[PDB]
Design a protein around this ligand. Structure first.
Ligand SMILES: *C(=O)N1C[C@H](NOS(=O)(=O)O)CC[C@H]1C(N)=O
Length: 263
């Protein structure tokens, strides 16, 4: 049997769907794993990796992050609260990246995808850092459909955590770019009820959320710095069988608590 898994199984049964969890202590190598290699929809959570892919490009393209993008109304899509405010002035690539990560701005994400050569360009970046699981093939809003058994626009909790560790703590980005990615994640505004609700208040957190909403689908991944300790990387993804099944931020927080307790 798996006694470590039993509280996760009870949580997902009460939720009425499936929860996927992977957590690793980067100091000790201790892990907590529940459905860690199953696929779950990415939803908005792809935007963290998008920002990292833009930072990687910015190492070789002088002034890329400083470049003003002067987009029109045709670039705007629902839930673009930051992009709606700069139609006459524009935003720099850095500002679009911050908006995509910290407000989950959809127009900003589509403008940055265009920079990379679309969803195929982001998937190619993820392959370049050793992630064979990540798949993205749609723009906002089509990537959010989250239909059960559709492997498009999915990854696994384990592959998300492994890629997050490479980009935030490892050598996949040069140090100035690694630091910018960490700072964007630390400044996220959309995750206060998810992994952040599970961590002691004094611990530093960087995270990116995803909320397809349909089929009980939502997620969060984070780098967590416990006071005086090596960082923890973790991912919590959910899905459910019925289209009208509601996501739960409380279930994500609860799964994150069990992960931290299990390390
Ligand atoms: C991301 O999944 N989305 C963007 C936005 N919410 O941001 S969140 O992911 O940080 O919660 C609206 C929901 C969703 C979308 N349909 O694009």
């Amino acid at each position: 049997t798996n006694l470590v898994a039993e509280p996760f199984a009870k949580l997902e049964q009460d939720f009425g769907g499936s929860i996927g969890v992977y957590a690793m202590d980067t100091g000790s190598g201790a892990t907590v794993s529940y459905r860690a290699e199953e696929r779950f929809p990415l939803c908005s959570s792809f935007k963290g990796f998008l920002a990292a892919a833009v930072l990687a490009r910015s190492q070789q393209q002088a002034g890329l992050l400083d470049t003003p993008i002067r987009y029109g109304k045709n670039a705007l899509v629902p839930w673009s609260p930051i992009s709606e405010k700069y139609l006459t002035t524009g935003m720099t690539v850095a500002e679009l990246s911050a908006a995509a990560v910290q407000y989950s701005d959809n127009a900003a994400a589509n403008l940055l995808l265009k920079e990379l050569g679309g969803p195929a360009g982001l998937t190619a970046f993820m392959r370049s850092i050793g992630d064979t699981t990540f798949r993205l093939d749609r723009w906002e809003l089509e990537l959010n459909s989250a239909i059960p058994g559709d492997a498009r626009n999915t990854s696994s909790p384990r592959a998300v955590t492994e890629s997050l560790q490479k980009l935030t703590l490892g050598s996949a980005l040069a140090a100035p770019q690694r630091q910018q990615f960490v700072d964007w994640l630390k400044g996220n505004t959309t995750g206060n009820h998810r992994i952040r609700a599970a961590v002691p208040a004094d611990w530093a957190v960087g995270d990116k959320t995803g909320t397809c909403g349909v089929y009980g689908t939502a997620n969060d991944y984070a780098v967590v710095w416990p006071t005086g300790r090596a960082p923890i990387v973790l991912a919590v993804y959910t899905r459910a069988p019925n289209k009208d099944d509601k996501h739960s931020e409380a279930v994500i927080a609860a799964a994150a608590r069990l992960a931290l307790e299990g390390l």
